[PDB]
Amino acid sequence: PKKRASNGRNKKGRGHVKPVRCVNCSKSIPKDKAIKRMAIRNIVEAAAVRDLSEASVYPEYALPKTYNKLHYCVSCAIHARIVRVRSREDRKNRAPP
Amino acid sequence: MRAKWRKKRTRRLKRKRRKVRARSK
Amino acid sequence: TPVTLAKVIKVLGRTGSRGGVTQVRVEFLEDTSRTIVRNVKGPVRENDILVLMESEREARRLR
Amino acid sequence: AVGKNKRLSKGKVVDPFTRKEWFDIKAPSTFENRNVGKTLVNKSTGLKSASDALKGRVVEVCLADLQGSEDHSFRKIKLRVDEVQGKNLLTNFHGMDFTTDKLRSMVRKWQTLIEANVTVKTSDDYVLRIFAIAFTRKQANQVKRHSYAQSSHIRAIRKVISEILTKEVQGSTLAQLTSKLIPEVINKEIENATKDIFPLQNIHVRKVKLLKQPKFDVGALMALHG
Amino acid sequence: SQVFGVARIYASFNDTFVHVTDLSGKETIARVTGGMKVKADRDESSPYAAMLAAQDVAAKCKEVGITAVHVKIRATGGTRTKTPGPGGQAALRALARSGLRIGRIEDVTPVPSDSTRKKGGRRGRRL
RNA sequence: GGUGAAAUUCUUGGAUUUAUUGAAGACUAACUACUGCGAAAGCAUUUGCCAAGGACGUUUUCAUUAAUCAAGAACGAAAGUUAGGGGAUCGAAGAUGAUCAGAUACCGUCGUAGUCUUAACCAUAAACUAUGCCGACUAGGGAUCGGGUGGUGUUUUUUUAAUGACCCACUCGGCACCUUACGAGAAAUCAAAGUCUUUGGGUUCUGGGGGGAGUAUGGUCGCAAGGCUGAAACUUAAAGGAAUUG
RNA sequence: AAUCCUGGAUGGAACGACGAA
RNA sequence: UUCCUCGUGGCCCAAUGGUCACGGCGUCUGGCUCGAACCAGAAGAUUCCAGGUUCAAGUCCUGGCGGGGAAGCCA
Numbered sequence: 086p087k088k089r090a091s092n093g094r095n096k097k098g099r100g101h102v103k104p105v106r107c108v109n110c111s112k113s114i115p116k117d118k119a120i121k122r123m124a125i126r127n128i129v130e131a132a133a134v135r136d137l138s139e140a141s142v143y144p145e146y147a148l149p150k151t152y153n154k155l156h157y158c159v160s161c162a163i164h165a166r167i168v169r170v171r172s173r174e175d176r177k178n179r180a181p182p
Numbered sequence: 183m184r185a186k187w188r189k190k191r192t193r194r195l196k197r198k199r200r201k202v203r204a205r206s207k
Numbered sequence: 208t209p210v211t212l213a214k215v216i217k218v219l220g221r222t223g224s225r226g227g228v229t230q231v232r233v234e235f236l237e238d239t240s241r242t243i244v245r246n247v248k249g250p251v252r253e254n255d256i257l258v259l260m261e262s263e264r265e266a267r268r269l270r
Numbered sequence: 271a272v273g274k275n276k277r278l279s280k281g282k283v284v285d286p287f288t289r290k291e292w293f294d295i296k297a298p299s300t301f302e303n304r305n306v307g308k309t310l311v312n313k314s315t316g317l318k319s320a321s322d323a324l325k326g327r328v329v330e331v332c333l334a335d336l337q338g339s340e341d342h343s344f345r346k347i348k349l350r351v352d353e354v355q356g357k358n359l360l361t362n363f364h365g366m367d368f369t370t371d372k373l374r375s376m377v378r379k380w381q382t383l384i385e386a387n388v389t390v391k392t393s394d395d396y397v398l399r400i401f402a403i404a405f406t407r408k409q410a411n412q413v414k415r416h417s418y419a420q421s422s423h424i425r426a427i428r429k430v431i432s433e434i435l436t437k438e439v440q441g442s443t444l445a446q447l448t449s450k451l452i453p454e455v456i457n458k459e460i461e462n463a464t465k466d467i468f469p470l471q472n473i474h475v476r477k478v479k480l481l482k483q484p485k486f487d488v489g490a491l492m493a494l495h496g
Numbered sequence: 497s498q499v500f501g502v503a504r505i506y507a508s509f510n511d512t513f514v515h516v517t518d519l520s521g522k523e524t525i526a527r528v529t530g531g532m533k534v535k536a537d538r539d540e541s542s543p544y545a546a547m548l549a550a551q552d553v554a555a556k557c558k559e560v561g562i563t564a565v566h567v568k569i570r571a572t573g574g575t576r577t578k579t580p581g582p583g584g585q586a587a588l589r590a591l592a593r594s595g596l597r598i599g600r601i602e603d604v605t606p607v608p609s610d611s612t613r614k615k616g617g618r619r620g621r622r623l
Numbered sequence: 624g625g626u627g628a629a630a631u632u633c634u635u636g637g638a639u640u641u642a643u644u645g646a647a648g649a650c651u652a653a654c655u656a657c658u659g660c661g662a663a664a665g666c667a668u669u670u671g672c673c674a675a676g677g678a679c680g681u682u683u684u685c686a687u688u689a690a691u692c693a694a695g696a697a698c699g700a701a702a703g704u705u706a707g708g709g710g711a712u713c714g715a716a717g718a719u720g721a722u723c724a725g726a727u728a729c730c731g732u733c734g735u736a737g738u739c740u741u742a743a744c745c746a747u748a749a750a751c752u753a754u755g756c757c758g759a760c761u762a763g764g765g766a767u768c769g770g771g772u773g774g775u776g777u778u779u780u781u782u783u784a785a786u787g788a789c790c791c792a793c794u795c796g797g798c799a800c801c802u803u804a805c806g807a808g809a810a811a812u813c814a815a816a817g818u819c820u821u822u823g824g825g826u827u828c829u830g831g832g833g834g835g836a837g838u839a840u841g842g843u844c845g846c847a848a849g850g851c852u853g854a855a856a857c858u859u860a861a862a863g864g865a866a867u868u869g
Numbered sequence: 870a871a872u873c874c875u876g877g878a879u880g881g882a883a884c885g886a887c888g889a890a
Numbered sequence: 891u892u893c894c895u896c897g898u899g900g901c902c903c904a905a906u907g908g909u910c911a912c913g914g915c916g917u918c919u920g921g922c923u924c925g926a927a928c929c930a931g932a933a934g935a936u937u938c939c940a941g942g943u944u945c946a947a948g949u950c951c952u953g954g955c956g957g958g959g960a961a962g963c964c965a
């Protein structure tokens with residue numbers, strides 16, 4: 086039977102969405118059935134930033150940031166300890182944590 | 183078995199029969 | 208023949224599949240203000256001391 | 271990985287940093303700093319003339335390093351070598367471009383992105399592809415959460431922008447354009463022209479690239495380095 | 497005061513490249529990888545290997561005359577991962593701790609405007 | 624290099640890597656969302672031309688011209704076919720390296736056809752909202768796309784105007800959504816799957832236990848691949864749907 | 870009275886079972 | 891019929907004149923687990939038959955046994 090009304094995705098009025106590729110397994114998944122995350126991170130880490138500031142000329146600088154948008158297929162997202170699995174009542178919860 | 187492959191088998195056998203009947207016709 | 212002494216300041220948790228390893232954040236006695244996260248094989252307390260054969264390495268922290 | 275190679279040689283020491291020499295890089299006078307850094311070449315033999323091996327070099331360096339100010343911290347500038355006079359090699363402007371960190375920082379969702387690009391030539395018979403970028407903003411008193419445009423606003427904005435750049439380049443030679451770029455007056459003009467159409471935050475221009483240069487004309491170059 | 501180079505870390509999975517140049521990039525110094533400082537093919541990627549590579553290029557730059565360095569960290573990019581590998585930040589910390597100075601880190605992973613096609617199929621790299 | 628790990632493979636003839644350019648062809652990131660248009664299939668760089676279309680507004684016009692529709696006609700993803708072109712990437716086949724008890728499978732490296740285009744065929748799909756179209760009525764709530772109305776509302780212009788962008792109230796139309804069940808339903812669930820034993824608004828199509836079988840035969844279309852149409856013999860007591868606890 | 874800050878991953882092999890109830 | 895070649899553990903196969911002879915599968919035993927697969931391990935040979943050379947023949951030489959291949963043409 087029907088597990089979901091959205092059926093997996095966000096296709097209401099479209100027909101076709103012109104998919105993308107999972108960055109882990111290269112699987113062609115539609116852009117709406119995918120899972121988009123955004124890994125906004127500092128370039129180095131929390132640890133070595135002190136060493137870098139110590140060894141840096143140009144003080145006060147910025148520590149710029151690396152921004153990469155991630156798409157995963159369902160299978161890879163579930164393997165990688167992401168959207169894992171939920172109860173029938175909490176499946177309807179559509180907001181993040 | 184999978185209905186897709188069973189279908190593929192019927193299609194192959196149809197092809198077989200079609201030509202072995204063309205042998206006479 | 209260089210080695211580095213490091214004082215334990217914080218025990219984080221156990222690690223390794225069989226639990227025979229412990230993550231600890233230490234404080235270098237010499238060249239203080241430096242804190243590094245390391246694995247340990249045996250039992251360990253806070254304020255124990257470690258002899259790092261090499262100081263420029265930290266473990267993948269379990270977070 | 272070390273002792274893995276089957277064969278190093280199909281058919282079957284001289285360390286070179288004694289064989290090399292250092293040069294220091296001079297930028298034009300449309301920059302509060304000239305001393306960019308240093309480079310390397312081999313010693314000028316008789317069959318090489320290292321000047322020509324070093325002529326067509328390109329070096330990208332930050333505008334904040336050329337001006338001192340960290341306001342122009344993203345804003346990388348590519349400089350092309352064009353002449354050498356005794357170990358103080360001169361450069362000229364080759365093209366600008368932003369940092370990916372700043373660009374992706376601009377690019378946030380639930381706002382509309384606008385882009386323009388024009389292919390204009392200058393007074394000094396250069397040809398440039400100037401890129402412009404802009405982003406919608408969420409006004410004050412605004413309650414809805416995305417601030418998208420109606421896609422004819424976008425075409426009008428792009429028309430305006432392209433006309434502005436074609437106007438402001440024709441008349442600017444190359445250094446005139448560099449000194450128009452650096453203070454970011456163009457962005458102010460775009461905002462003053464588009465405020466009557468749509469808000470438009472983050473109207474930093476974008477990378478600019480040369481396509482084809484005129485003849486060398488060493489005099490115009492040495493006019494810069496005083 | 498400071499003589500600047502450019503470090504160009506390319507930190508993929510399966511390997512890590514530290515190799516440093518003048519500001520122009522045409523003239524290069526001290527290209528060393530992780531697989532030159534380890535013998536597995538399995539630890540070519542690892543932070544220890546990258547750290548050793550960075551130590552070597554720091555030594556060579558210092559014995560040339562270079563004192564500071566700009567950084568351009570990179571992944572395989574293109575159609576491939578675009579997330580940097582493990583041994584990039586390690587090499588960075590290493591060449592910082594060795595005695596060099598740093599200026600203007602940047603990430604220069606080559607990104608497409610939806611270029612050609614990823615490999616694996618539409619069903620993916622199965623395993 | 625690639626991998627879970629390796630190996631095939633490339634490398635002192637300088638591989639990988641760096642910088643500078645050039646060419647080719649494909650693609651159109653991030654913006655890109657419970658957002659838009661389209662009869663559907665489907666459609667995402669810019670600008671220009673060409674013709675079209677929906678909604679909105681209208682104290683304009685005809686005046687029942689309409690709804691659904693065997694026959695019959697147009698478009699119809701991808702794959703595929705013919706002929707030219709182009710042929711960078713990926714890559715049914717195939718070849719190889721491994722894995723394995725075997726592995727002509729998964730993984731890796733190559734790689735033809737195809738992938739793109741033009742002219743012409745095909746006429747299918749989980750072509751799915753698995754929900755026919757037209758129409759009326761029936762509960763609350765907010766958000767949003769497009770148009771429109773009103774407001775001494777906010778901001779920018781030239782303090783000021785008219786604009787434009789926002790705010791509030793309302794409205795027509797659309798993609799949808801949330802909550803409840805008065806109701807319906809076998810239930811899962813449904814503002815339509817309701818107004819159906821208190822059984823009739825209008826119309827088209829399809830189905831009648833499971834297999835055999837979408838098979839055989841005969842027609843028809845097609846270059847073919849195949850499509851549309853489509854049995855019987857024989858066989859069987861259960862197949863199946865939704866939920867329940869293990 | 871001094872005082873700038875952070876969160877984060879994968880990782881091989883594992884065939885089969887008379888029906889009756 | 892002639893010429894050439896072959897014969898080795900239950901099967902396939904290798905051998906420098908120089909150890910009652912190498913390998914793989916099969917078989918037997920034990921272990922993991924009921925069986926496979928896997929891990930450890932064993933045993934099994936008159937090297938087709940009869941003679942000869944040599945200190946010694948699986949091997950080197952003559953004869954037979956059986957298997958295979960090539961040739962058997964001009965008319």
Ligand SMILES: [Mg+2]
Binds near residue numbers: 100101
């Ligand atoms: Mg579809």
Ligand SMILES: [Mg+2]
């Ligand atoms: Mg090279």
Ligand SMILES: [Mg+2]
Binds near residue numbers: 651668
């Ligand atoms: Mg785009």
Ligand SMILES: [Mg+2]
Binds near residue numbers: 658659
């Ligand atoms: Mg839109």
Ligand SMILES: [Mg+2]
């Ligand atoms: Mg059908």
Ligand SMILES: [Mg+2]
């Ligand atoms: Mg259907």
Ligand SMILES: [Mg+2]
């Ligand atoms: Mg209705």
Ligand SMILES: [Mg+2]
């Ligand atoms: Mg409205």
Ligand SMILES: [Mg+2]
């Ligand atoms: Mg509405």
Ligand SMILES: [Mg+2]
Binds near residue numbers: 098797798
């Ligand atoms: Mg709609």
Ligand SMILES: [Mg+2]
Binds near residue numbers: 831
């Ligand atoms: Mg019946």
Ligand SMILES: [Mg+2]
């Ligand atoms: Mg029936």
Ligand SMILES: [Mg+2]
């Ligand atoms: Mg019975």
Ligand SMILES: [Mg+2]
């Ligand atoms: Mg069921």
Ligand SMILES: [Mg+2]
Binds near residue numbers: 885
């Ligand atoms: Mg069996």
Ligand SMILES: [Mg+2]
């Ligand atoms: Mg069986």
